[PDB]
Amino acid sequence: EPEWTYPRLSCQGSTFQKALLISPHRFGEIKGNSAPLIIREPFVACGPKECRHFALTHYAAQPGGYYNGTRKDRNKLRHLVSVKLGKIPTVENSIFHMAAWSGSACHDGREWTYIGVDGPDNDALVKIKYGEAYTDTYHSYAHNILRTQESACNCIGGDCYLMITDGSASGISKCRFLKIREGRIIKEILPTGRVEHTEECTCGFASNKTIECACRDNSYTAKRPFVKLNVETDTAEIRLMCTKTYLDTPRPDDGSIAGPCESNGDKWLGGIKGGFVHQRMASKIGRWYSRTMSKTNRMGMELYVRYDGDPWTDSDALTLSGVMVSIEEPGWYSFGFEIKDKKCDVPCIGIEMVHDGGKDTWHSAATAIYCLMGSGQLLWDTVTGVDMAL
Amino acid sequence: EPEWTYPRLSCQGSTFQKALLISPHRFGEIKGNSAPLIIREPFVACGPKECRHFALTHYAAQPGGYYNGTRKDRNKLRHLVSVKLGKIPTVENSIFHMAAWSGSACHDGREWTYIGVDGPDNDALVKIKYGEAYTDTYHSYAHNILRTQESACNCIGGDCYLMITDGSASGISKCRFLKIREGRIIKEILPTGRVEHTEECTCGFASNKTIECACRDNSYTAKRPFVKLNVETDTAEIRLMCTKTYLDTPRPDDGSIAGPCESNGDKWLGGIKGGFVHQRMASKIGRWYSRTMSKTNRMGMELYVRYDGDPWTDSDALTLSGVMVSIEEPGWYSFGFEIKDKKCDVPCIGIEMVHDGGKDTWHSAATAIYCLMGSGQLLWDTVTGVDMAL
Amino acid sequence: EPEWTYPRLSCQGSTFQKALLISPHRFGEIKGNSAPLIIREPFVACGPKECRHFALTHYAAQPGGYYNGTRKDRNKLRHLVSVKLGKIPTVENSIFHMAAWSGSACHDGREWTYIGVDGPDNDALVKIKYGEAYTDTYHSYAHNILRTQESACNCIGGDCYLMITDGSASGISKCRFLKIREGRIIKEILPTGRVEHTEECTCGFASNKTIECACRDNSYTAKRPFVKLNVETDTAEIRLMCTKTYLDTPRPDDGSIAGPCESNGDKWLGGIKGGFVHQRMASKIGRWYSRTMSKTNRMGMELYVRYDGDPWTDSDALTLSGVMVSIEEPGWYSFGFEIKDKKCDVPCIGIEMVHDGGKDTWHSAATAIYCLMGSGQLLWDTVTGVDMAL
Amino acid sequence: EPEWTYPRLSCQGSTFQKALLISPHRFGEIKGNSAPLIIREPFVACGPKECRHFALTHYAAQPGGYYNGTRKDRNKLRHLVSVKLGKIPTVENSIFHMAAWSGSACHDGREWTYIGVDGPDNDALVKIKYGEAYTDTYHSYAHNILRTQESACNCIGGDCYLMITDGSASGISKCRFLKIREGRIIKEILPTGRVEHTEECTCGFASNKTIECACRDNSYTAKRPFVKLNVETDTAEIRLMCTKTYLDTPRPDDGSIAGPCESNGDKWLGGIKGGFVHQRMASKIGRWYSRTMSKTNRMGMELYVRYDGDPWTDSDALTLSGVMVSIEEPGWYSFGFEIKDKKCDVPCIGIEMVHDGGKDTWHSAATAIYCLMGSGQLLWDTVTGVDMAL
Ligand SMILES: CC(=O)N[C@H]1[C@H]([C@H](O)[C@H](O)CO)O[C@H](P(=O)(O)O)C[C@@H]1O
Ligand SMILES: CC(=O)N[C@H]1[C@H]([C@H](O)[C@H](O)CO)O[C@H](P(=O)(O)O)C[C@@H]1O
Ligand SMILES: CC(=O)N[C@H]1[C@H]([C@H](O)[C@H](O)CO)O[C@H](P(=O)(O)O)C[C@@H]1O
Ligand SMILES: CC(=O)N[C@H]1[C@H]([C@H](O)[C@H](O)CO)O[C@H](P(=O)(O)O)C[C@@H]1O
Ligand SMILES: *[C@@H]1O[C@H](CO)[C@@H](O)[C@H](O)[C@H]1NC(C)=O
Ligand SMILES: *[C@@H]1O[C@H](CO)[C@@H](O)[C@H](O)[C@H]1NC(C)=O
Ligand SMILES: *[C@@H]1O[C@H](CO)[C@@H](O)[C@H](O)[C@H]1NC(C)=O
Ligand SMILES: *[C@@H]1O[C@H](CO)[C@@H](O)[C@H](O)[C@H]1NC(C)=O
Ligand SMILES: [Ca+2]
Ligand SMILES: [Ca+2]
Ligand SMILES: [Ca+2]
């Protein structure tokens, strides 16, 4: 049998560089002959010998006739789909995994675990598939839109950790973590700390004993909730990030939130899922983050890094590393993932570039990928090249 | 060599939940650039490492110009086709197995067995393919439209059991079972009991010694014929189901048929293939069924369960478990199948949702899948999302 | 390494039955969204674990704009292409093997051998590819359109035999056979007997020591040239078939050619490649043939069988076995091939059904397949279902 | 683990012959239903069991709406893509490897190495991918459009050699060679000799100790720079080819450049990447080259051969071997590659046939392949068959 997967030391590098752009709508012209799927919330998850590009589709293509409702978030048509990283997600190239309006996926070194949530809002359901089999489900506990990550889950030794949350977008949404093995929930983990609102966590391995996540708090602050989950004891604690470099959107000027680390500041109602990925060295730990260039709008995307320290307590500003997407371009959700190289892991940040043209036309997205490679400074940005009027 | 397949104990679960929807016609708009095939009578059959989604196509696509005749059942163009479960059955994604206007398929743990019937009505022919080779055939015995299951066949130890029938849709159609091994018929089985009319059986393993099937009687009753085939002796007996919860369509009010179990009641001419799948426990046996919400029309689909007892004699009503498809939606054929998980089998029910718009336009279908997963109550229904006018 | 392939005994059966229809032009409507390739001269060749459907394309699709010249036979655009048997040969599904306006292919149990002829008419060239590598070539010897089989080549123990010919369509075209091993010509074989005109041979194994072929004589007779190639000595002899059942098209009434077996009769200028496949039994040898229903036109196709005897000397009429294609349908080239089953070989006959609508529109073909299966009589015919005006 | 790859002796042959034509735009008609990608700079690279056809796409298809800018060379949309040799490079068939406006790729016998350059002109970046992982990068040293080969890199024992260059198209562009192993740069090689301008080298193994390349000098001569890289010492020297048969375009009459081998002659500003491939014999060494038929324009393509001698010093004219593409047809870039046969290597020359119709329409290319096969003389030329107005 294939051995289980474990996080390794990251590959040598000191900078991220532009790697790949998946812009399916460059082939959606009325005049063309292609069938790109209408998606949102894309992410990437890799196994030992291949990366898959997942997304939640509206079960419709461009060109097409089912544009009405593609801006709506939850419905009975949404499905979690995927293609091998590098292929254009078309009607024919995609595989439909399950019905879901919220998802996640990960590989334990032996098989794929697909997570998808659906069901009525007041009683949603987390469904789990292992390979080709439907294995387990989890019920809503706050009866207000149970939902999950929108990024990869994290496995170690055959145990995969996943964040789920339930609650009001504008109130309390206390999250929990699920310990899954071979498609079945073996443990339920209730976190400690600042818990009032945690959603859309982007998690990763900081080491073999700790999983860290940068999340979204949709109602109380522009500071991102940060999770430390001890895999050894299966205990999690959450505290807000202390950096002057607020990573949520919308947000106020940097360092404008006065008070100790724990101070929420103004509500700044709303948020965005943020990119976060680890760079593990024998001695150091690099934490890479991404945020929109606009404090108010989903445009642009900047890279930031920060070595060592403690996110829960360091107030210091993060170090700008580069502009991945300019303000003229869409900068929506971002996520982190790692590519498995021969003897080391490669950290990457993916970016969702949504083509928004209103409620009267289609609504979909491109996915730009940036990975740690070589040294130097980040050289080039990403554009989608799509004219929504074609 | 790979070992043969045997039924195992079902996976832990106490409820079915919405799993997947294959709606190819969401990409058939005149405006689109896709080629979904025109099909009917879909089913699913799984091997140890993959499920295939089979159907009988009219060898035509939407958009297209061969809509005339797609409502006709038998012709010289129909073919048995398949895609891996999860892929949209398009012109290019499908594999054409053989010419057939009635089919079945199953995997013995080593190879695929494709069954397809064609030939003139008065002298049809059951043809058998094993992998890439045409291996055997079976002739018509009643000379009135020989036909088969329209669902998976069942294998154990390399022996696959298949139901075939021959006879008048409005009269006697006595069925037989064929014992096949490696593509060749090794035995012919003539059942005992109530035999006047049995067709379109949905069979499954109740254990390693018994195969049970819920069938359709098209001319004498709204009660479904139920088969018990002893794999050990190769003997089969048939008796009608005694439940007050009549599973055929059309049908009369529940429990309206007076008399002992054997009473047919009024003719209620016509029928529908029904879903039926087993849930095997160490001590118990769960029997899951599906039927249309309308007593008269092919709309809606309800799930029902019943633990233990004897179908041939228990008059008790089945226990409603959920609405998989509302009355506003099409509820046509349904079938059962099982997904092979690492150490247990997963029972599922598939539903054919036909887009019927008359004899002047195309006629095709979506396939909704529900599988046993987790506990609780069934949460959400399925809709096709197709506007036949696009 | 995989062992080499050898002919085995055929599988049990006493009749051919309709198996499969590949009609790509059912998806070529102006209104559709497909891309079937424009082809002619299709054939099938099988390895141990898969059959491939080959053809010579005009490097154009329907719908499209390169219909002018698709009725022309040789040009610089033609290519030998293939798909796995069962897939529709589309622009994307096909693999382009090499430039050729005449082809052949076969598998030795380890790898594929692709044969393709191209080059100017007065100095054509047989090119040989083994797997992904171009291995050998053969020059024109009569400088008048060197060409090959248009059906599978035959391998035994790693040695593959192929018929090539050169000469005037209306005069002498003496054929030769090439002994190839691992992509390179190891021997050249010059046949004895009646050699004035042999082309488009359909060859097969009658046993482990003899390869027999039914060929076409385009200028001197309506009787088909018949080859007996002794694999042991690498010697070939050719004599005309003596049957009253003339297998070429055009042809005169049956048994109308007076004189001994060797008499050519009237010229009946022209011909057609004919189907021919062996049924090997421990004691007997069945020879199956196919010919058009019309003596003058390429419409319809009949099956015939003949057990034992000697084709070179038996004048007896062949035994009609069935109508595979009615006179209302196109009956062009036919070929034979064998499917490898677990422990026996399955003989099949393929039929080219060309959609001819003149020099002003596209010109392409469907492929119908009939294989030996079960017993009884041949039940059903094949139709293409294509309306050339769509 | 699979053993590393090493150059072997070439397969027996004495001539090149027409092998294959990949003309994706034969399926790009407004009327068609296909999606060929818009590309330029195609090349081929083979592993032990498969060849891949690479190219730099403009991330647009025909028919489509993104033709403006497809004649521009560098931008943020270009990507290195590939298909298995033989498949039409369509939107769905292609795999997108990375963002790059200049590329190269090669296989070491265990894995694929993808090279792609992008970034701003004054600070471009060579990025390296090994399999699915981004492994290394290389910075610009002359800050004037760092770029690479546009043909396969060359591996031996797990070490792959690649040419990169930097500098003014109209001035000095001193090249360097990178020694890469498993995706990471292990050595940097600075060549000796005539170094003022070397770009777009077409390299190959002349033996296990020497890699030779025919390159382009865009500003000082119509004579091609020729590299001899000793793999044993990792030292490279460059000198101009001495042949009277000038291989660049534009160029003056043959032998019109007076003076010793080293004389540049007139500037003849501009160039073209040229085909070059080795034919290794136990005693001899054949060097095959290709050049446009027109001295001034990119039309036509001729083959030339030359056995033994020393390119740096032999003034003798090369021996014309054939016309692969006539003057009526486009003859743009050409490259060499080798197919791995069972026990020998097969040398081939690929040709880029660009469909140029101005800056107001699409700009893309066909790829014709010629390989060493059999003996005799080169028989047939290649045409694209594309009408740019459809
Ligand atoms: C399960 C779900 O509905 N997720 C949706 C979330 C959700 O509103 C917030 O997490 C608050 O709970 O909103 C985002 P957006 O509009 O901010 O892009 C789109 C998601 O599809
Ligand atoms: C072989 C065949 O013809 N099967 C057809 C059956 C058949 O009429 C009944 O089983 C009675 O024999 O009807 C159904 P339906 O119209 O009820 O959906 C469609 C099937 O294609
Ligand atoms: C190599 C070649 O040209 N083959 C062609 C042959 C050829 O004329 C005859 O064999 C006489 O040599 O004709 C047939 P058809 O028109 O009879 O269908 C079409 C083939 O493409
Ligand atoms: C990296 C790059 O820009 N390469 C381009 C080169 C380049 O100008 C010359 O090598 C001079 O440096 O030109 C060619 P062309 O127009 O001659 O076909 C097209 C290439 O895309
Ligand atoms: C995690 O543990 C495994 C051994 O159990 C080891 O091979 C791997 O390198 C460890 N990861 C880190 C970051 O040390
Ligand atoms: C059927 O028999 C096999 C052993 O022959 C066993 O492994 C399997 O679990 C049995 N099935 C059931 C339901 O007991
Ligand atoms: C041909 O020879 C091989 C052994 O060399 C044998 O297995 C095969 O059955 C033979 N074929 C026939 C028709 O006897
Ligand atoms: C290169 O070296 C390997 C052994 O290291 C050998 O097998 C191969 O044939 C050599 N190549 C040539 C051209 O001699
Ligand atoms: Ca917020
Ligand atoms: Ca396709
Ligand atoms: Ca009934």
Ligand SMILES: [Ca+2]
């Ligand atoms: Ca003739």
Ligand SMILES: [Ca+2]
């Ligand atoms: Ca020059």
